[PDB]
Design a binder for this molecule. Sequence first.
Ligand SMILES: CCCCCCCCCCCCO[C@@H]1O[C@H](CO)[C@@H](O[C@H]2O[C@H](CO)[C@@H](O)[C@H](O)[C@H]2O)[C@H](O)[C@H]1O
Lengths: 55, 486, 159, 66, 57, 65, 103, 274
Amino acid sequence: PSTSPADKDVPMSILHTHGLSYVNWCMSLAPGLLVFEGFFRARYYRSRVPPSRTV
Amino acid sequence: TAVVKNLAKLPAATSQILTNVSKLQTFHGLLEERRDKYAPLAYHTYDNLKQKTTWHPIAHAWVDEGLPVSKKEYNEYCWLKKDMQRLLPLASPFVFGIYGILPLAVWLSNDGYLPSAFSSKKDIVSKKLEWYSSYGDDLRQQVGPMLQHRLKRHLRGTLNNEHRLMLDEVTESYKEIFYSHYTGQLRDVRKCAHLRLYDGTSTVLLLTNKEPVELTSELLQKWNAIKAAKLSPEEEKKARNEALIEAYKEQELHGGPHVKHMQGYGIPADTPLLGENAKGDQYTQPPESASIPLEQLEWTGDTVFIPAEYRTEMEDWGRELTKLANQFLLLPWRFVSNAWNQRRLVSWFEEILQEDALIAKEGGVQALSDDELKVALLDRAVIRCDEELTRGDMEARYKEISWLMSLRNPFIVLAWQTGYYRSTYSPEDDLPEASILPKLNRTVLDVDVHNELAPDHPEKPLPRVHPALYPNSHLALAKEVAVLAK
Amino acid sequence: DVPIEKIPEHANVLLKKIDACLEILSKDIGEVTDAEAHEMYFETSKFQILHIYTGCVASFPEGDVPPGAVECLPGQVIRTKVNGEDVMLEIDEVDPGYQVCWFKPDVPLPENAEILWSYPYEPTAALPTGTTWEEGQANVLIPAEPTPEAAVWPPTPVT
Amino acid sequence: MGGKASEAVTIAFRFPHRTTFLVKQNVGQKLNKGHQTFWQLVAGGWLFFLLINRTSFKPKLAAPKV
Amino acid sequence: LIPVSLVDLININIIFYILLLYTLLLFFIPLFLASINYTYHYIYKYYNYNYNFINNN
Amino acid sequence: VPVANFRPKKPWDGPWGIQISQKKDRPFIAMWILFPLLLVDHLTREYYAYWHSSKVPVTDVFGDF
Amino acid sequence: SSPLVPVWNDLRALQVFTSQEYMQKRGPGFTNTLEYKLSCLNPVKWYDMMKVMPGGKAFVGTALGLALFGGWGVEFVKNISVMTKEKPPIDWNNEKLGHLTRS
Amino acid sequence: MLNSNIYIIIYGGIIMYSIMIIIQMFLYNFSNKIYIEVEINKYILSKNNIDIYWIICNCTIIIIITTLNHIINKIGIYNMIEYNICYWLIGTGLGLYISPFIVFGYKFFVYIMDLNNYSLNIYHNNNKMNDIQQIYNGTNYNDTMIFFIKDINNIFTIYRSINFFMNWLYQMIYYGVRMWLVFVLHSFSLGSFGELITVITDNNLIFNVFYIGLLGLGFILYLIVIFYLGIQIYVYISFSLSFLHSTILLFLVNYIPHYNNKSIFNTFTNKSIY
Ligand SMILES: CCCCCCCCCCCCO[C@@H]1O[C@H](CO)[C@@H](O[C@H]2O[C@H](CO)[C@@H](O)[C@H](O)[C@H]2O)[C@H](O)[C@H]1O
């Protein structure tokens, strides 16, 4: 029948993580999202100009 | 509910069903006895891909001009054929078992699913009108607009390719036929006949002992004249063959028949002689009939109709447009090839043509009653029961679609019919307001069928001229005048 | 049952109806001016918004910037109050050989500077007054918006 | 690997012939049809063929004779 | 390499992925078709039948 | 007399337009509920096998076992 | 595709037009020969001339040829690489196992 | 027990990852629709255009969606799905393969079953003996004593009918394998170079610094990855459609010239003569 063994239940802690390199972190594409979120937000919300008066 | 109401009369209905079957058998015996000696053999023909039969009314829809039958009796014949079609769920227990009775219950629930025997009415006209107003107009009013869209999108094509497929001369007529529910103006049937410009020229080759000859208005006029003179066959055949050789020479001077230079059709040239069989310069081998002198040119009694429907033909319609055309006409459509639905549509067409002939024998449309004319127009699918038109409008409608069906083209017929089933619903209660003008009235005189109409140029439509304004109209309209004033 | 004299009455009725329609449909909704709808146009500027309510803005020739002055380059957004009106000023096309900077009172102005607009001294004030652009201090242009000719349908003649 | 459509004829080269509806005058060929009792004998032969090939299910052969 | 494997060639898990994906596609087709074009507005506004009358005199 | 080519609505005329709009924005609403559920399904997950695992989670679909 | 295609087309045209040339040369009288009268009673000819008929008869002919002989053809193709291979003796059934008295 | 035949299938994260691929289609809203419109109208003209168009659109947008989910939304299956061969052969290639057979299957089937009646195609076939050979004998060719080998002939003729539909399958498999190899090998090579750099810098902590920059290297790699994979997806789509044209859609070229009609208001009929 269906099962749920205790072997899958193991200790967890972020302290034991090896982690990532600077290169692997750059390959995670977070630095790209960081820029392009603002890029696309700016393009969308700057395409629509409001009315104004020229001084 | 209606289930028990119909079960109450199910015992009383079997006797009427069997009586109706006997009537159908007798009438079919008579009709087939006449057809088997007066009607020609319309051979079976397969589509371009040569896997399924194709059907056209010009060859297969024969009209027995001279059928000694009352119009109401033919209505009974057709309605009882439809009742036999509706009796099909009785086979469900005999193929599924005793548990095949729930389909029979669903059959007995709705009265529109049932044959005539389950109806309380007696006259075929009242019975037909009851069935229509209860089930059939509603079923048809939900297929009309979608069928119209399919016909449009069959002409103009899919995926923004109208510049490659549509014609710039049928444009204003297309608009008036398909977008007159926007304007609210009436339509001229000739503008629907203009849709045939999408097609080629329809020809008729008479097969002789030498070559095929294209039929023309002149040759047909001469043949009708010879037929009217009532001459001996020794003179009749002689005059027919004289006209035939004259037309043969005329077309040979024209440059052969139109069919020789049409994509998809063609007449082969003389056969070639291959290799050593070639006798010097004579590279050809003429047929046997070349030996026959041209003075012996005789009609074989065989004919070949070539509609040249390159865009209108029912083969290229599709799996869906055929089904919707049969739905809109309240015909059977499910679980069959387009060939079988083509035959069903052509049989409906033949029925309507025979009914038109019998109506003309019985003294035209004006001899009919109001309910009978309403039912005729419902059969033609040009009226919906939520209109309440006048008698003159109904007569004009009948004349319109009768002329349109005289041309033997289902596409333009459906294009005309679907225009009378484009009804909207308003979101507000006050709007549409109550009108101030009277109801729409017309007459048979307002319909222009006896005159030709050139296609209006694109974005330059012209106003409509009444037939009465034409010169010598009182002489041309004298028949309609005599029929109406009386 | 409809005489020909009764037609223009019907035409008048339908004219009244369609006129009641067109007097409404002749109206149209203009461009929206709610700042809450366009706040992200200014949020997404290439420079942070300067909430200016003190000091002065001055034009002076290009070169070294005085230390303490906040440069106001093209694309700079400035939230201010002008004649009691809360406004955003977006810099566009500063002239060549010149630059613009916000000079707080702590910052001394350089030579050859022209004060374009200035603010008063109101340190105790909670709601600042802003500025007062006098006639000749700033040339504000309202759009002309020339209403073109009303589109008339050609009447066909009847002899 | 394999061929292409550019290297072969079209579905229009094959199947190029459009439709032409033939009609023939009635001389009386479909009249005086004989063998009026044909379908009766055909149905009889069909039922005979079905009967000789019939086999009723006889579960009594599985009776516990032993 | 890991993706170089015959087990991953006919992987039933990816087949379940494809199945659920395209069943959901089929479920949501009538919402993908629910975009409005403004062509019949143009036809209603611009199609103008000839309104001139006939006058023999 | 009423105006032509107009009628009252019927059941086979389908729902009104506002109802079709309400049908359209249901995926857009479930998006806000499902993307967090996707992230939770990934984040609150545990691997099913290890080098030490003598057992693996089994799921009898039809209870035949 | 290969560049030998026009060569094969030329050879195909050769055989086709030569057969047609022979048919023209011998002229009428083919129906009086024994070949025609026997082909009229030959099921191969019935099948071959029914294949090209309309009404799905091409599909019928192809599927019939498949169901009848194409299965044996598949087996034949499978058996080309089996004839040369060392195979063991066929363990013919002793026809002793299976018999059991009824009770 | 004997009758118990047991199968082990495993199952993982499928449901919630496949739901959002479809939910995103409302956001993209078929942005690729115009490109495929242009290409389909370039490659074919028929009533059944929209059908094939819709198919490709769905297929293409799904690919695009997965690619972006493979680049950005990195969870569970979205990382592997472009590195798996089953997705590229069955999840992208099979649909594009069967799309013309599902849209134009009637014509292709009729064509295929007619080509089993193998015959030489003659242009301007005004010959008479050709007809007798095609009807009596069945083919232009000499079929004498080919029934003797009919068992093979049938199946061979079947291939002879589909041989000109086979390069489409070959190109689909080839480009699926190409995309798989491209994604896998480029990811592996990039990660390998990164790991070698990390080994060089971990052993020399004077260099174990953000030497290019926190965003500079990441922004550059983002641009490189997206540019390369977008080029590859464009290559896949465009070449798949060009090969669809050159392999499957040239069969359906049927240009009909427009012939003017003259007998519009009158039609000859069976009653005109009989
Ligand atoms: C126009 C440019 C032309 C030059 C082309 C240069 C090749 C560029 C290939 C781009 C494709 C590489 O694809 C990219 O591979 C990297 C490296 O594994 C993956 O990166 C992922 O795996 C690596 C492996 O260690 C992890 O360290 C990293 O944290 C994670 O993001 C990306 O998720 C994937 O998108």
